[model samples]
Target: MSTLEQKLTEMITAPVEALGFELVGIEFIRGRTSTLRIYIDSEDGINVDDCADVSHQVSAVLDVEDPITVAYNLEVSSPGLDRPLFTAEHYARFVGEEVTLVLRMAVQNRRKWQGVIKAVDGEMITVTVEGKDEVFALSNIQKANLVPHFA
Candidate 1:
């Protein structure tokens, strides 16, 4: 997570958890209009009502904190089948699952990787790609998502 995202997570996580949902991650998209997207999850899954509830609580907190100087849109969503992996704990939980990841910097002459997660040892993640195991630092990953399987 970037510094901004880390800060946002720390601020919003408690409110989301109070409502009985896990704060999956935060995405701060900068564009014509900035967007602050929050991903959430629950044991029984999430719906529109869940999103609405979180939005209300989070909006109240953000209003008081005023973390962002510029205008931004706040969004609440559930992490679907293609769940994004945002933390070391997330990577550890999904070991043995197929995933696609992009790195902030190239590794072994490649910046993109698709493979099955083999292991997560501290901050290092090992993935098997085409019968070869590649190790990556958690800090090096820019984005990562589970490769959903229908069956």
Candidate 2:
């Protein structure tokens, strides 16, 4: 685990949660515009007003902390159907859901695989390869995506 990542995560979550906001996680993405996407959630669901408030606080925090040293856009919003499953709990919570995995190193001589998430434990994930119809852990996945079939 990256200590810097953990520290930054804690720093971001503590205050956000105290403000009754759910801190999903932070992802550094390079897109049409570079961004530090801050995924947040709440029971009644995030509202525009709530988002406005959180956005300010997040921006304030980042500015003071200086964790990110880049000219990137700050995005604070919901994690929708294409919501990324970054932690083991996300997979555990949404078992039987389809997901796409991209490994840093090829697993089973494959670079990418699409299958249903069977189980999530720590850093390991059990996925049932579609064609093979067998469940196995495609360990050391570099990245994974939820394959939400429909809204």
Candidate 3:
């Protein structure tokens, strides 16, 4: 996690959690037009009003903290169908599901992979790709998301 992400998590997690939501993760993109995306969830599910409510609360906290030095768009959202996987627990919950991931470093001359999650053992994730099981360290993953299939 980036310093900004960590700070954001520290700053707003309590407020979000107090509202009976789990902070799924934070995503920050820095540039001329920067964006800060916050993902939140609850067992009852999320809606537009939920996003808006969290947005208002998060905006208030950011306004006071002023940690983000740049002008950025704040987006409070639910992790949708193609939800991102940020931790070992997230990956474990989706075992036997199709997922796509990007590696921080190349593994076997490949940086991108798409496969069905075979298992998550400790910090290692096993994915079955083309009938071959490939194991990857969770720390090596830069990004990962479920591959939503609609029929």
Candidate 4:
């Protein structure tokens, strides 16, 4: 059954969406003193009200499930401009926008690349790094983000 968090995560995923949450995913990194964080988002956008609502609902579920030993913060909000793009569709959606991409292992001795998102295929992303065009297969990507636009 994986871990307690995994079970709790599965339990809440569906009901959270029924309550109108996008259910991006959950994060539970235990610190020295045991700190846990739950991250959530919605497609329409997340706000204080949405977070609060989800918090209450999730809190109730957690109370029943009792996953963690210590209390944790249930944070619900927007993914932000620096949002981590993990899916090919995410990379494709912003083809003309700037993005920062890093590979899991350095390709040609470099891991970081930045430029506009040129294109996204079923499992690959293309970016124009400097004057050179770079392509990354999904599994090799360490992280990716949409560059902030002042406009």
Q: Can you tell me which runs of candidate 4 are displaced by over 4 Å?
A: 32-34, 44-46, 67-73, 85-98, 101-113, 116-151
Candidates ranked, most accurate by lDDT first: 1, 3, 4, 2
Report the C-alpha lDDT of model 3 over 1-151, residue by residue, as the tens digit: 5455676677777776777775556788777856778777777667768678768878777766665565556776766766578888978988878888888877567757788997899998888887897898999888887886668
- List, in order, the clash count of every candidate structure: 0, 0, 0, 0
How does candidate 3 fare on TM-score?
0.50
- Clashing residue pairs in candidate 3 (N, C-alpha, C atoms within 3 angstroms): none
Q: Candidate 1, residue 45: CA error in Å? A: 14
TM-score, per-candidate, Cα-based:
0.48, 0.46, 0.50, 0.51
Q: On a 0 to 100 scale, what is the lDDT of residue 113 in model 3?
A: 77
Top candidate on lDDT is: 1
Give the residue spans of candidate 1 off by over 4 A: 1-77, 107-110
List, residue by residue over 1-151, the lDDT tens digit for candidate 2: 5326458668878887887765457887757645677877777577866776877888787767654565446776666777555665666888878888776556567657688777766666666785555543445566777786776
Error of 3 at 53 (Å): 1.8
Worst 10 residues of 3 by lDDT: 63-72
In terms of TM-score, which candidate is strongest?
Answer: 4
In model 2, the runs with Cα more than 4 Å from the true position are: 1-3, 30-34, 67-73, 84-151
Per-residue alpha-carbon lDDT of model 1 for 1-151, expressed as tens digits? 4446567678678666776765457888877766788776677667768677768877777767655665557887765756478798989989978888888866577757788898999998988887897888999888898886668
lDDT, candidate 2, equals 0.69
